[PDB]
């Protein structure tokens, strides 16, 4: 029945996207209640390593032009928190969904709503690596694009794009202003730290394969979780903790978690020219919940 990377519907996030303009630089922002969150990098202009406490002294609210669509918003006061600005605007956003602020942990997925000039352009599925980065697709004007998780009818905002460390590797800040990983909003060299293949996601992806015809890799041998973590230190894999969703997936398919872990180790050294859901490499970008909702819902 097919396995893809899905995205959360964007209807509750789009009405919250605004543009923030200082000087001539324009980036994106998020409008919730009477606050507007956007990167502090909007007040710089002078390249390289800005002096943000020094630049704040000259900035006044009247020089921010925040616009939702074609409507103009007036900034009362502002506040630098970490690496973001929390702008307080006159207007209470009428389309503010029930929301909360969260922090994604490595291996967990979310949806990025890519925006330019305060205008949404598209959305895509991303996974937070052990390097506290994401494999996204961003250009100039994309900072401030938000990453979020849909939770019933509530939106848990988790990500604000800010930085491209290297080709195809990005990161940004949570909505407390703190960067994901040991990075910072400066144009100095910050190549990412070591990354690991997300084991829990690879386990879930193989359960999806089992529920989708492909189960040839399943054998009677089994490798415990704690015996896997000692092997994972030296083969580029992350540590794995027990999981209901994996237990639920295990119960549905009739294959224990320990069989999947043992199948992972054998397949770490070649897929033998065979394919798993049309793939020749592990897929670690689908959480257990992502897989379960595409097997049942």
């Amino acid at each position: 029945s097919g396995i893809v990377k899905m995205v959360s519907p964007t209807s509750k996030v789009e009405p919250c996207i605004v543009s923030v303009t200082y000087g001539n630089m324009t980036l994106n922002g998020l409008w919730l209640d009477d606050k507007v969150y956007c990167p502090r990098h909007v007040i710089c202009s002078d390249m390289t390593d800005p002096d943000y406490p020094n630049l704040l002294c000259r900035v006044t609210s009247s020089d921010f032009c925040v616009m939702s669509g074609r409507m103009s918003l007036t900034v009362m006061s502002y506040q630098m928190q970490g690496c973001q600005l929390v702008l307080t605007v006159t207007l209470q956003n009428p389309n503010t969904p029930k929301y909360s602020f969260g922090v994604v942990k490595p291996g967990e997925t979310f949806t990025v709503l890519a925006a330019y000039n305060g205008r949404p352009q598209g959305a895509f599925h991303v996974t937070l690596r052990s390097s506290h980065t994401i494999k996204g697709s961003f250009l100039c004007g994309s900072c401030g694009s938000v990453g979020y998780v849909l939770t019933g009818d509530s939106v848990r905002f988790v990500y604000m794009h800010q930085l491209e460390l290297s080709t195809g590797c990005h990161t940004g800040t949570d909505f407390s202003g703190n960067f994901y990983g040991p990075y910072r909003d400066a144009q100095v060299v910050q190549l990412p730290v070591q990354d690991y293949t997300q084991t829990v996601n690879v386990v879930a992806w193989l359960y999806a394969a089992i529920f989708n015809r492909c189960n040839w890799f399943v054998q009677s041998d089994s490798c415990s979780l704690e015996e896997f973590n000692v092997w994972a230190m030296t083969n580029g894999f992350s540590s794995i903790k027990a999981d209901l969703v994996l237990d639920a997936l295990a119960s549905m398919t009739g294959v224990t978690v320990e069989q999947v872990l043992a199948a992972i180790k054998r397949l770490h050294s070649g897929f033998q020219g065979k394919q798993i859901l049309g793939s020749c490499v592990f897929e670690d970008e689908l959480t257990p919940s992502d897989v379960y909702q595409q097997l049942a819902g």
């Binding site: 900072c143 100095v188 910050q190």
Partner: peptide, 5 residues
């Protein structure tokens, strides 16, 4: 070297 978006 890292690019600010």
């Amino acid at each position: 070297x890292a690019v600010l978006x």
